[PDB]
Amino acid sequence: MYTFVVRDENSSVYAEVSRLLLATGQWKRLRKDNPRFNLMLGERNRLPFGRLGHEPGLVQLVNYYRGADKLCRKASLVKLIKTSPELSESCTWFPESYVIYPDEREVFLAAYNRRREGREGNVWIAKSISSEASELLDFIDEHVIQKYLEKPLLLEPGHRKFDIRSWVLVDHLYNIYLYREGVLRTSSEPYNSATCHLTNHCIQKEYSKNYGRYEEGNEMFFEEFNQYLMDALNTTLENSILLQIKHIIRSCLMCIEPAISTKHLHYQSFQLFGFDFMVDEELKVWLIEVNGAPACAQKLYAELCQGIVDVAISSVFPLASIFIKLHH
Amino acid sequence: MRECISIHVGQAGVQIGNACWELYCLEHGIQPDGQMPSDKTIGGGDDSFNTFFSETGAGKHVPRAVFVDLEPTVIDEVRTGTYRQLFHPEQLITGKEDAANNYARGHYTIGKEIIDLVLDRIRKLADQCTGLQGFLVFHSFGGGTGSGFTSLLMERLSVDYGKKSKLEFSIYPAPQVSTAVVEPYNSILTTHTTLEHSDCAFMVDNEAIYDICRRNLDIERPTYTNLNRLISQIVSSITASLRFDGALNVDLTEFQTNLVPYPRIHFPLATYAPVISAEKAYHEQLSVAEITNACFEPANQMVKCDPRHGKYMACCLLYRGDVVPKDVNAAIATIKTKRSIQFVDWCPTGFKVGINYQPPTVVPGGDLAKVQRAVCMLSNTTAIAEAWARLDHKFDLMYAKRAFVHWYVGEGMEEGEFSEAREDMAALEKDYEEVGVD
Amino acid sequence: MEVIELNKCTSGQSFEVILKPPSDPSLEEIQKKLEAAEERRKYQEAELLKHLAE
Amino acid sequence: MREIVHIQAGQCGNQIGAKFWEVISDEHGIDPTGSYHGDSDLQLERINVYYNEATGNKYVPRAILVDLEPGTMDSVRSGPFGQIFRPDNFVFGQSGAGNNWAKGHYTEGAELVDSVLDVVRKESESCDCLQGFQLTHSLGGGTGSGMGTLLISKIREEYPDRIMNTFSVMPSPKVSDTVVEPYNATLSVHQLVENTDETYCIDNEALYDICFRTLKLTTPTYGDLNHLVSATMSGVTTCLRFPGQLNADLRKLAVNMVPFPRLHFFMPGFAPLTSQYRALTVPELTQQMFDSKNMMAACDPRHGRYLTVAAIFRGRMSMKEVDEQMLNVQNKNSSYFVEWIPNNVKTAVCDIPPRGLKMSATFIGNSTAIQELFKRISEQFTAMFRRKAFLHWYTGEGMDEMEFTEAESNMNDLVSEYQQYQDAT
Numbered sequence A: 001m002y003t004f005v006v007r008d009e010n011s012s013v014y015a016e017v018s019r020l021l022l023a024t025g026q027w028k029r030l031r032k033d034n035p036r037f038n039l040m041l042g043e044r045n046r047l048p049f050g051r052l053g054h055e056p057g058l059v060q061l062v063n064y065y066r067g068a069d070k071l072c073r074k075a076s077l078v079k080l081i082k083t084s085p086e087l088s089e090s091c092t093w094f095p096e097s098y099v100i101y102p103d104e105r106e107v108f109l110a111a112y113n114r115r116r117e118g119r120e121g122n123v124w125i126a127k128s129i130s131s132e133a134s135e136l137l138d139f140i141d142e143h144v145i146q147k148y149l150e151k152p153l154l155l156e157p158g159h160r161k162f163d164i165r166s167w168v169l170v171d172h173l174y175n176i177y178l179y180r181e182g183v184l185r186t187s188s189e190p191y192n193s194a195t196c197h198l199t200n201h202c203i204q205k206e207y208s209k210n211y212g213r214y215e216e217g218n219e220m221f222f223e224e225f226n227q228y229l230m231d232a233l234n235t236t237l238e239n240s241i242l243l244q245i246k247h248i249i250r251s252c253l254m255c256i257e258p259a260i261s262t263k264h265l266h267y268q269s270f271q272l273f274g275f276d277f278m279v280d281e282e283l284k285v286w287l288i289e290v291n292g293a294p295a296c297a298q299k300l301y302a303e304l305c306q307g308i309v310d311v312a313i314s315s316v317f318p319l320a321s322i323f324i325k326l327h328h
Numbered sequence B: 001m002r003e004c005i006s007i008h009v010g011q012a013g014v015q016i017g018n019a020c021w022e023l024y025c026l027e028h029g030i031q032p033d034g035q036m037p038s039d040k041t042i043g044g045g046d047d048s049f050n051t052f053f054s055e056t057g058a059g060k061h062v063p064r065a066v067f068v069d070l071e072p073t074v075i076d077e078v079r080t081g082t083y084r085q086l087f088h089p090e091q092l093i094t095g096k097e098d099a100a101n102n103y104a105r106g107h108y109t110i111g112k113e114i115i116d117l118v119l120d121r122i123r124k125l126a127d128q129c130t131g132l133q134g135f136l137v138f139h140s141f142g143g144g145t146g147s148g149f150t151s152l153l154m155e156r157l158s159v160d161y162g163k164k165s166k167l168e169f170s171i172y173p174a175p176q177v178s179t180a181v182v183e184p185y186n187s188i189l190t191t192h193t194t195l196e197h198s199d200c201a202f203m204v205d206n207e208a209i210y211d212i213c214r215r216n217l218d219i220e221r222p223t224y225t226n227l228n229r230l231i232s233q234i235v236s237s238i239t240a241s242l243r244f245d246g247a248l249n250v251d252l253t254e255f256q257t258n259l260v261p262y263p264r265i266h267f268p269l270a271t272y273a274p275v276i277s278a279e280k281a282y283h284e285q286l287s288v289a290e291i292t293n294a295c296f297e298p299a300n301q302m303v304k305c306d307p308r309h310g311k312y313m314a315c316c317l318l319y320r321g322d323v324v325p326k327d328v329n330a331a332i333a334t335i336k337t338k339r340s341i342q343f344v345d346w347c348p349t350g351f352k353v354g355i356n357y358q359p360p361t362v363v364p365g366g367d368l369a370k371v372q373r374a375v376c377m378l379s380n381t382t383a384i385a386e387a388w389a390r391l392d393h394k395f396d397l398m399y400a401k402r403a404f405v406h407w408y409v410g411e412g413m414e415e416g417e418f419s420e421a422r423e424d425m426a427a428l429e430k431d432y433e434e435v436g437v438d
Numbered sequence C: 001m002e003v004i005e006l007n008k009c010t011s012g013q014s015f016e017v018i019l020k021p022p023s024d025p026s027l028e029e030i031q032k033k034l035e036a037a038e039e040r041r042k043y044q045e046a047e048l049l050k051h052l053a054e
Numbered sequence D: 001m002r003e004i005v006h007i008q009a010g011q012c013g014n015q016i017g018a019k020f021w022e023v024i025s026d027e028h029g030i031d032p033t034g035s036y037h038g039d040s041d042l043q044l045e046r047i048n049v050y051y052n053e054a055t056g057n058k059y060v061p062r063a064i065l066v067d068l069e070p071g072t073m074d075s076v077r078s079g080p081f082g083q084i085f086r087p088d089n090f091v092f093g094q095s096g097a098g099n100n101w102a103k104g105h106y107t108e109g110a111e112l113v114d115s116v117l118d119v120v121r122k123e124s125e126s127c128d129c130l131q132g133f134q135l136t137h138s139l140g141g142g143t144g145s146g147m148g149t150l151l152i153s154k155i156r157e158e159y160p161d162r163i164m165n166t167f168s169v170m171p172s173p174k175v176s177d178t179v180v181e182p183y184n185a186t187l188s189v190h191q192l193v194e195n196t197d198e199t200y201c202i203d204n205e206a207l208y209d210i211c212f213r214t215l216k217l218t219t220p221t222y223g224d225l226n227h228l229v230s231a232t233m234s235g236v237t238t239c240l241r242f243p244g245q246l247n248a249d250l251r252k253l254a255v256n257m258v259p260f261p262r263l264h265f266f267m268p269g270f271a272p273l274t275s276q277y278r279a280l281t282v283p284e285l286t287q288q289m290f291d292s293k294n295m296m297a298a299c300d301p302r303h304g305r306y307l308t309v310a311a312i313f314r315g316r317m318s319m320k321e322v323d324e325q326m327l328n329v330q331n332k333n334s335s336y337f338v339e340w341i342p343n344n345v346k347t348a349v350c351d352i353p354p355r356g357l358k359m360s361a362t363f364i365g366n367s368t369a370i371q372e373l374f375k376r377i378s379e380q381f382t383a384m385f386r387r388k389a390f391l392h393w394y395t396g397e398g399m400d401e402m403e404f405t406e407a408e409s410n411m412n413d414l415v416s417e418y419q420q421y422q423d424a425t
């Protein structure tokens, strides 16, 4: 009999994981503060990594990688990509970005002034969209600024934007598992270069009349998107987009591996990641963000969560494929 | 030549001290009867080993050490053991009934009755010193004497030797070999009372030593004898600079200068390699690069923690055996491009290196195999605060219910000293996070 | 890197390699604590012996 | 030399006390004449905890035999090891106590108590470092219960800085002599709550069930019950009588086992309990040790939570395997161990096994389920007290009804105190 604790009630993914473990009859849940656990479904903030791996006779596993915030924070990612030689500023798959404190202000202007000088695309986005640098800087003082993909791939019918969410699982041995099923969080509004710009699933259901016109929940899954690519552009999702996604995933994860690996550590880590990608009109893939505590598509919760138990949990705690192993 | 006085307090301190002086004798070629053939200046001298050993007219080399325990049984072992001839009885101080794993009992009730006798015996050794530089104090956190009496002794020493340095070798409590449920209480209590009086303290977590013995020496259930043999190796490599010719950490003041920029943050993490079982007939001798790379594996640290998530303030590499500086720098260059080594912005990223050509000595018939070269890294990393957080958490669980507190109040201690010592620990954890976290 | 302060002798040598530049209470006050603790002990015992006398 | 002074009072106390000295005398290689004939230095390394050394290298138990009538003590003096006891340490009266706490505590007992304390003082004065005292007695009678607790109160007055330890036999209607046993036990428990540091609660109900259900004894006698008790007493004192690191003296044991001063009543357990040549593996000892059917207090451990536990394994065995099995018990049933006392289970291992066994395990638990024992006594007490039944036996000795009311309230407080910590998280 194995034991585990739940310390993140708001976790929808591991709520299902916790439900699956109990339904196995070979796992027992303890109080959130009972130390004699095998598995910790930890909280998102201030997880006490320092208290793990100090229980004699307990192989302890936690569902987060200590130090992974460097990859899953707006400013952290930008700094990691510019400062890591494994990635370098010669990173062809990451949008030109700059960290701005309410610092790289002078650098953001040096490149901004060159774009208005060159008369080329000079639209950016701020987060933690405008062609005027002053409006962005005045806004942050009330973050990060990267180039806004003004030439994005638009789905038809609709002439509309979207983004790609990929779920990546990393086990205690640091194998990279890419869930075969992704989702396109689409914008049900046509793209206007002068709600249709932010593909967020929440902004689409709250500020879009056409929420659900083309696809249910503004979510197009890979089976359909692949067929569209074949019918519209005479290509496959694998060749045109998925190769670049796999390349970006392992590049990012292999970069921080020396800093977060638990290979020789007194406790073990696994973690589910959410990568968000943008595709341009020329079928180039861009990394937008990495989510350290992502949710899953309603339809795929069952399959993904079951794969977490198979490869991430039962692999360390055996009982009595839906992933792609990105080798490295 | 400046002398150092070693003080061993409680069972842990006494038994560990017994293992270190045994190892010192083997290293300096001092026989159990105190005679030292290689010592040509009979009955005197100011050599490097004279910082730890005095000399009698008959040629005996006597450890500059005092053993203190509120119970006689442990120190009776030294009185009748192999090296009984080393010490004169004035150095071995024992009581009748111990502190019963009760800090308050060791500090107030029983400590008050024996503190003056220990000081007088220590004063006797200080009077034989032409230039005393300070003390090395060995003790456990968890015992009633090692925790309670040590903190009282450290207080009085600051009064009677305000200028002298004081270094600790502290045994951090581990349930796999612990003997009292209240050891977290005694740990916080003695760390709070001793903090201002200690210049540099090397914590050894029994958990880490235990697992090292099981994993690298193939000991199913290690005993104190197994643990203390290994701890004496680490202690020896740390004090070798005081006992041998050299230019790194030549006096106790240099330990503070090289390892402790912030006074309260005076707990360097010790990492040792290699640990090879003597049962392995043939073993591949590890290189300078391999044993240096091992200095950044948590599995080899004296306290299990992750320096990757934390910043460095200083780093010393102490090599014993066949090591030349060229190989050290080559190994360091390689490691810097593969490890996560972050220093605080206000500190240089570097290593103070010391090499002693004499390879490590091993107790004949012990568990550690002879090796061609070994290294002890001393790194002041903020990651060692993980041990404080673990300890303060166990403290909080029990104290919220006042569990066992009556044992301490009954000895004259006030309940407020608990939260005061806990507040001090809370501040200590805050300091570490300021220095190590962005 | 940069090697500095190289010192050599018969028994070994030491040096420093840099990879990158940066960017008490008195005896009286103690005695009052001890005697105060011993006082509380005697008080608590006296109250016990008072309870036993009753 | 941390000497312990043993006291046994009343019929029950002197009968279990005598068996206890027969058992440990054999373990330490001492014969009925006081001479040593063992083959291991471990037998004598801590022999001074319970034995005085006399002329001719004789070993004399540091035991004081007390009773208000000579009957049981005359039997002890003629028993197997009767001659080993110091003659001057037999302190006895003639009137008896009539199974009456008031007689032992206030009238008949008061006349004899000073004589006992004279012998206690002579034993203590010659102690290099006196640990404290251990008393064997029952709570349902008059001498052991009434005079036993009077002795405890007067010993504490003269030796307030010494540990007070008792083996207290709890009455049960299943194994009962008189109907007033709940009165005597309730009055005694209040004394114990205040004036002992450690009390092993030995329930005659548990002893009988083990003899009947487990050992297959259809008609158990007191002699059968005492065989379990003397075997348990040998186990719980193993750490005191042999060299060791854990719970090796009375005060360190109390520091590990008593988180709150009044909650010092322990459930003892023993394994194996067999009706016999078969080898008992380390996993088997551990499961049986924590099995309620091996407990001596007739309380369900799963009805409460463990504040603290002391375990002792005796015999040649794998200490590695012992550590593994103890960790398995806690990690498998961690809900029954309070989480606000980390690492509250301590384990000791002694190389010398008890007589007849290659391996044994003794369990000492501070569980909140012990409240079931005090609730049982409180219900039986109240059933009679509400009608003042049998009170005249006590008012005739000078006691007032108020003192019964206070003893009732005190034990109900004790039950409420245990319930408080059974819900703490």
Ligand SMILES: Nc1nc2c(ncn2[C@@H]2O[C@H](COP(=O)(O)OP(=O)(O)OP(=O)(O)O)[C@@H](O)[C@H]2O)c(=O)[nH]1
Residues within 6 Å of the ligand: B009, B010, B011, B012, B013, B015, B016, B069, B070, B071, B098, B099, B100, B101, B102, B106, B140, B141, B142, B143, B144, B145, B146, B147, B171, B172, B173, B174, B177, B178, B179, B183, B206, B224, B225, B227, B228, B231
């Ligand atoms: N490494 C090591 N740890 C020890 C040794 N002896 C005891 N300990 C640890 O020290 C703690 C117990 O404290 P002790 O040193 O035995 O107690 P004490 O200082 O003698 O004080 P008293 O309570 O009066 O006996 C526990 O955590 C033990 O695991 C030893 O020889 N080596």
Ligand SMILES: Nc1ncnc2c1ncn2[C@@H]1O[C@H](COP(=O)(O)OP(=O)(O)CP(=O)(O)O)[C@@H](O)[C@H]1O
Residues within 6 Å of the ligand: A095, A125, A127, A146, A147, A148, A149, A150, A162, A163, A197, A198, A199, A200, A276, A278, A288, A289, A291
């Ligand atoms: N550089 C860029 N170019 C083009 N579109 C961009 C962009 N940066 C962001 N976007 C758009 O803005 C949307 C929201 O981006 P953002 O990374 O802030 O989502 P978010 O982090 O606030 C919620 P989640 O964590 O689920 O992704 C993206 O889905 C995308 O449509």
Ligand SMILES: Nc1nc2c(ncn2[C@@H]2O[C@H](COP(=O)(O)OP(=O)(O)O)[C@@H](O)[C@H]2O)c(=O)[nH]1
Residues within 6 Å of the ligand: D009, D010, D011, D012, D013, D015, D016, D097, D098, D099, D100, D138, D139, D140, D141, D142, D143, D144, D145, D169, D170, D171, D172, D175, D176, D177, D181, D204, D207, D222, D223, D225, D226, D229
């Ligand atoms: N286990 C055990 N219990 C006993 C023995 N003798 C009496 N008792 C119990 O002790 C209680 C009676 O106390 P007793 O010792 O006979 O009275 P006392 O002589 O005045 O102390 C009853 O609950 C009996 O069940 C015995 O030899 N063994």
Ligand SMILES: [Ca+2]
Residues within 6 Å of the ligand: B039, B040, B041, B042, B043, B044, B045, B046, B047, B055
């Ligand atoms: Ca000399």
Ligand SMILES: [Ca+2]
Residues within 6 Å of the ligand: B158, B162, B196, B197, C024
């Ligand atoms: Ca000072």
Ligand SMILES: [Ca+2]
Residues within 6 Å of the ligand: D111
């Ligand atoms: Ca009379």
Ligand SMILES: [Ca+2]
Residues within 6 Å of the ligand: D114
């Ligand atoms: Ca008298």
Ligand SMILES: [Mg+2]
Residues within 6 Å of the ligand: A289, A291
């Ligand atoms: Mg986000």
Ligand SMILES: [Mg+2]
Residues within 6 Å of the ligand: B010, B011, B071, B098, B143, B145
């Ligand atoms: Mg001790």
Ligand SMILES: [Mg+2]
Residues within 6 Å of the ligand: D011, D012, D141, D177
């Ligand atoms: Mg009777």
